[PDB]
Amino acid sequence: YPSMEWPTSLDIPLKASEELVGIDLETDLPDDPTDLKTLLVEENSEKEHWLTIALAYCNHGKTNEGIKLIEMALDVFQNSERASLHTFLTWAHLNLAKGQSLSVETKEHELTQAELNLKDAIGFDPTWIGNMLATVELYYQRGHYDKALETSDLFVKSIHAEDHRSGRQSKPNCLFLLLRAKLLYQKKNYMASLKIFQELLVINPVLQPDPRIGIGLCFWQLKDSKMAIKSWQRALQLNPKNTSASILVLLGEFRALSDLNNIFSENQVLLTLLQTYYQLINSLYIKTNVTNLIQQDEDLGMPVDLMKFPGLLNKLDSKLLYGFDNVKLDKDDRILLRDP
Ligand code: NI
Ligand code: NI
Ligand code: NI
């Protein structure tokens, strides 16, 4: 398959001489990012290096450190050079805000921090795709689905208008499509949603988040529970760290029994599963409950995270948002292109 893996090391050009200090992004980052700040400031390092480093923290479980670094960068870079620092801070706070167990206030507190940085970013660079996507993602995360879909639809018209103005053909943007597919599913238009998720599978079969999660949720809401489960097992196969896939595969296959999956649910919901330990009125109760909690995550198991796109938040290169042009679409993926 195609590859969206981040460069795994960084060379910082030293200021006085012309040697380069190499950093292994996966083991060389210190617990206190101030150490690099010293280096980065001292050697007059370029801004994109601050970003690349902060993204390494975030993508290796260290978002607080990622945030601490770019917040320090804000004391170094001036005026318009601060825009892309604010964009990073927007997406870092959107990632925080997706925290699995935040109370509605902590969520909104993090989303406010994102919005504040977003305002500073758009003030300098309103047409940057990183800032436009964040505007839509903020509406989504706040549940304002109608405004999100309407803002999305204005944005793609704008970009289309812009391609006439530069004599270019438009290329579908995977995250605008992903946002549309998710908004459509919120509006219960599961058929239009499913088509977009399937479009995404052929454009970028290594897209994060996995559009197969959405493929399965569309099948499920369209009552083809057999294929929903196949989409989800394909997701969990290509990436066994996908917790959302895991919980969906087991909640789906779980339609004695209520022991076999509490033990499989401890490997990687477990509350209400234990509430359901409390004429088969009962079988419809466990059935309803499994359905309710398969639908409990308003994020649909597909968190939109710009930190999964090499070059995007650290170099203003949005190329990877358009995916790949040859589709070796594997046997177990091409199945998922089918109708219900
Ligand atoms: Ni914060
Ligand atoms: Ni905070
Ligand atoms: Ni046109």
Residue numbers in the entry: 10 to 264, 283 to 295, 299 to 308, 1041 to 1102
Paper text:
The highly conserved eukaryotic multifunctional polymerase-associated factor 1 (Paf1) complex (Paf1C) was originally identified in budding yeast over 2 decades ago1, and robust data suggested that it plays a vital role in transcriptional elongation and chromatin modifications. In this study, we determine the atomic structures of both the human PAF1/CTR9 and yeast Paf1/Ctr9 heterodimers, both with a resolution of ~2.53 Å. Our analysis revealed that both the hook-shaped (hookfold) PAF1(57–116) and Paf1(34–103) occupied the concave channel and convex surface of the right-handed superhelix-folded CTR9(1–249) and Ctr9(1–313), respectively, with very similar conformations, although the sequence identity was low between human PAF1 and yeast Paf1 or CTR9 and Ctr9.
Next, we used the same approach by creating a single polypeptide through fusing Ctr9(1–313) to the N-terminus of Paf1(34–103) with a TEV-cleavable segment. The crystal structure of Ctr9(1–313)–Paf1(34–103) was determined at a resolution of 2.53 Å with one molecule in the asymmetric unit. Superimposition of the structures of the yeast Ctr9(1–313)–Paf1(34–103) and human CTR9(1–249)–PAF1(57–116) heterodimers resulted in a root-mean-square deviation of 2.63 Å for 198 equivalent Cα atoms, indicating that human CTR9/PAF1 and yeast Ctr9/Paf1 subcomplexes share similar heterodimer structures. Similar to human CTR9/PAF1 subcomplex interactions, the Ctr9(1–313)/Paf1(34–103) interface could be divided into three regions. In this region, Paf1 had a longer loop than other species (e.g., worm to human), including a shorter α-helix (αC') that bound the N-terminal tail of Ctr9, which is different from human CTR9/PAF1 complex. Notably, the [Ctr9(N16Δ)] mutant did not form complex with Paf1 thoroughly, indicating that this longer N-terminal tail of Ctr9 is essential to maintain the interaction between Ctr9 and Paf1. For region III, D95 was the core amino acid in the C-terminus αD' of Paf1, which bound with R221, R243, and Y10 of Ctr9, mainly mediated by extensive hydrogen bonds.
